[PDB]
Design a protein around this ligand. Structure first.
Ligand SMILES: Nc1ncnc2c1ncn2[C@@H]1O[C@H](COP(=O)(O)OP(=O)(O)OP(=O)(O)O)[C@@H](O)[C@H]1O
Ligand SMILES: [Mg+2]
Ligand SMILES: [Mg+2]
Ligand SMILES: [Mg+2]
Ligand SMILES: [Mg+2]
Ligand SMILES: [Mg+2]
Ligand SMILES: [Mg+2]
Ligand SMILES: [Mg+2]
Ligand SMILES: [Mg+2]
Ligand code: NA
Lengths: 177, 79, 114, 152, 66
RNA sequence: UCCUCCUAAAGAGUAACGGAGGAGCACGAAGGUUGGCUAAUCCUGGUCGGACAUCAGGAGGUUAGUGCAAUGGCAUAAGCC
RNA sequence: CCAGGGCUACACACGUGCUACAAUGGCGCAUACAAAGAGAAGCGACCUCGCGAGAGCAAGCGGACCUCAUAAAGUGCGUCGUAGUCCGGAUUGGAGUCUGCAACUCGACUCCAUGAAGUCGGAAUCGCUAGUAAUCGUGGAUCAGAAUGCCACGGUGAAUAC
């Protein structure tokens, strides 16, 4: 949306001068957003996973992909094929539409918001963030929902380092400390 | 809870507190005034109050100003 | 009908529905209607949605269920960490106002465990 | 011997029924005139009579399905009514299976276990629950409606 | 998109009490009114107004009216 | 009675009341074909979440997998949809 | 002899009580009918201030005159319409008044908020034959302050005894 051309018109020029880039497109860019939540206790009951899937489809207008256990582990008593959690990945336009409304309404609605930590990068330039609450998004009316299941936001950028990854997210007015 | 006026402390504690602040931190004061309220000038001291058998060292911090000296000295043992 | 948390109870007089807010009792309830121009006898489902707006802001001047739980929590938590005598009685789960524990005080001790 | 037991959820305390005057009759002389009634939380109230006098039409309008010319039946504040009709065939339709049919009736228990046990407690083997719920016969149709009120 | 297996996704008008009228695409079905957005959220000026819990010495000193 | 390895001396075969393990089945798809896909284990970052669930990157390379014991095999996959 | 602490400690058990579980009851407004008793480093009118505990000035009374001191159930109107509720009042946080050198261990009371167990109680067991049982209020002793206990006073007032 507006964030996309804002990136084209401002962020590219902001980062080109800062890091002394020689080519136009060597500046990093975000390529996808991955949303999930592993309900886990859906081992006992099935209707929780269908409820979580309805939440993710409300937060982002896509049907979540149900994910199943990769290997049987006796610690939590699960086996291969058991659906454990959902997953949604956003690319292109729908990525920006969710991204713009994450940084502008959802995060400011966090109860006792103090600031998102800037040391959450995975060592290559990608950002991961928990939310602990699915009510901060306006698409939840607090009455349909029953549980307090949290999401897991992942920012997959093409940055070669977290030093560049921090700068790219900062140029989008990301609430770091 | 005391009354409308006059946070009540004994002279001998108040007199001893005055000489305690003139030399910074010092040795703990061996006092018996459990009823004496903690004045703000007692912050940072290491007053020792009687619990019946043993003077216990209580280190007065900024948050203990409305309480009394014997309030931080348990006087009966359990388990 | 709808205040800070929820004014769910309908069919009830005004001075009773506002009692459902954690932080509003009875005299604090009557303070709202005295300055809101609404009589005590008035029903919640009968008053207009415009007067709900005036009810909302008067309640907001007090401290209610949201921030009052935090406000109370620090009051208890301060004593516990400070190591006061009342802090000890909060940790041990015994009455703090200096009363009997020989046979009574089942409210703080709880169910009888022999 | 199937092992069935019914347990409450809120257990109202004062009374359940409140009937003022029923005066319900289909196409002939009305089967009852007023029938002032009160239950008082218990009183298992065995309705009786020879067949054809309208004891089943009393219960059907006591639960609010058939509208009477009465003045309402005034259930309690938190009544959770469980119905076992004299004829029970509309429930066993749409070719749900034994496990499928039982599953939707629940409020807090889990879908895989704690409904297999309740369904399997009343004599339903492992291979008996993977067949359509409409092909059941007689007592098993009745036994389902006892299990229906187990989780409910 | 896989042809009507997803919820409806349209454009709504989300606005704040202090303005902040920003058009967005969401799945609610009706416009939404909320508090101050990230533009006017006091996460960058109320820091001193946020860490203020406490105060006992000065409160007693007020009661020292003699 | 049948199957796998060693004794069995680099073709086949080769004994002992020699050393070790399995079978008396299963599947109407777990067969045929076409299209597509690639694991274990680790690190980092991430709400409940934890040594270990689900996710995002990187190392690794088949140390995974095969309805069933062992041997031989399998990336053109015989493994997974 | 003195200061501080204890007799107020709490996995637990018992005895005697107070308050409740409500609709012949809660709450608001108005309105009546008592007896007995105490008071001088004491009872302390009236008025003003404080929502209240009380504070300031302060007459009278060592008294059938003055103070404590309004008695309360009852009575009429309204509301609540069977809910853990407009029942219940524990526990806890905050802000205070007063007696006292001193209210932390441990005082009473008032205000704001919080508002729990309890929806008539197992085996067993207690009191009462008439102004009695049942309930409602009041005073006195001890006492600087500190009673649901003790001693006493009256109001309404039964059922049954073959
Ligand atoms: N829809 C109807 N139309 C006409 N008459 C009806 C209708 N339903 C019931 N009746 C008649 O009214 C009476 C009510 O009978 P109903 O079907 O309620 O069962 P019942 O009398 O309790 O019988 P049973 O003891 O055999 O179950 C009967 O005489 C019946 O014939
Ligand atoms: Mg050979
Ligand atoms: Mg050879
Ligand atoms: Mg030979
Ligand atoms: Mg095969
Ligand atoms: Mg192929
Ligand atoms: Mg094949
Ligand atoms: Mg002594
Ligand atoms: Mg004693
Ligand atoms: Na019938």
């Amino acid at each position: 949306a507006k964030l996309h051309d804002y990136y084209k018109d401002e962020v590219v020029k902001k980062l080109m001068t800062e890091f002394n880039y020689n080519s136009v497109m060597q500046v990093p860019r975000v390529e996808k957003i991955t949303l999930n939540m592993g309900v886990g206790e859906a081992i006992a009951d099935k209707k929780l996973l269908d409820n979580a899937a309805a939440d993710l489809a409300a937060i982002s207008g896509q049907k979540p992909l149900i994910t199943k256990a990769r290997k049987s582990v006796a610690g939590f008593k699960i086996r291969q094929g058991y659906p454990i959690g959902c997953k949604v990945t956003l690319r292109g336009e729908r990525m920006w539409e969710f991204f713009e409304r994450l940084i502008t309404i959802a995060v400011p609605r966090i109860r006792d918001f103090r600031g998102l930590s800037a040391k959450s990068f995975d060592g290559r330039g990608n950002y991961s963030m928990g939310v602990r609450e699915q009510i901060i998004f306006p698409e939840i009316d607090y009455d349909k929902v029953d549980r307090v299941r949290g999401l897991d936001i992942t920012i997959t950028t093409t940055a070669k380092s977290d030093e560049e990854g921090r700068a790219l997210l900062a140029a989008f007015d990301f609430p770091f400390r | 809870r005391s009354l409308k006026k006059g946070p009540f402390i004994d002279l001998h504690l108040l007199k001893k507190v005055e000489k305690a602040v003139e030399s910074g931190d010092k040795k703990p004061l061996r006092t018996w005034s459990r009823r004496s309220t903690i004045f703000p000038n007692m912050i940072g001291l290491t007053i020792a109050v009687h619990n019946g058998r043993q003077h216990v060292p209580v280190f007065v911090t900024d948050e203990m100003v409305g309480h009394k000296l014997g309030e931080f000295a348990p006087t009966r043992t359990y388990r | 009908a709808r205040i800070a948390g929820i004014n769910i109870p309908d069919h009830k007089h005004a001075v009773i529905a506002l009692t459902s807010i954690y932080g509003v009792g009875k005299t604090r309830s009557k303070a709202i209607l005295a300055a809101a121009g609404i009589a005590e006898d008035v029903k919640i489902s009968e008053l207009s949605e415009g007067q709900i707006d005036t009810l909302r802001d008067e309640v907001a001047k007090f401290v209610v269920e949201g921030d009052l739980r935090r406000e109370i929590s620090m009051s208890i938590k301060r004593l516990m960490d400070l190591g006061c005598y009342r802090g000890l009685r909060h940790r041990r789960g015994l009455p703090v106002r200096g009363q009997r524990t020989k046979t009574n005080a089942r409210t703080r001790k709880g169910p009888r465990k022999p | 011997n199937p092992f069935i037991r019914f347990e409450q959820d809120k257990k109202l305390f004062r009374n359940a029924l409140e009937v003022e005057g029923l005066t319900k009759g289909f196409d002939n002389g009305p089967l009852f005139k007023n029938l002032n009634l009160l239950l008082e939380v218990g009183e298992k109230l065995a309705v009786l009579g020879t067949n054809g006098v309208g004891k089943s039409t009393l219960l059907k309008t006591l639960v609010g399905d058939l509208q009477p010319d009465s003045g309402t039946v005034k259930w309690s504040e938190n009544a959770r009514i469980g119905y076992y009709a004299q004829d029970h065939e509309y429930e066993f339709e749409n070719d749900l299976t034994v496990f499928e049919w039982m599953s939707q009736w629940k409020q807090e228990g889990d879908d895989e276990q704690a409904v297999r046990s309740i369904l399997g407690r009343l004599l339903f083997s492992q291979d008996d629950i993977k067949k359509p719920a409409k092909v059941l016969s007689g007592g098993e149709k009745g036994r389902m409606l006892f299990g229906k009120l187990m989780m409910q | 998109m896989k042809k009507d297996i997803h919820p409806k996704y349209e454009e709504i008008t989300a606005s704040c009490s202090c303005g902040n009228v920003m058009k967005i695409r969401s799945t609610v079905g009706h416009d939404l009114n909320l508090d101050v957005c990230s533009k006017c959220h006091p996460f960058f000026t109320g820091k001193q107004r946020d860490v203020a819990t406490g105060g006992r010495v000065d409160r007693f000193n007020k009661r020292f009216n003699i």
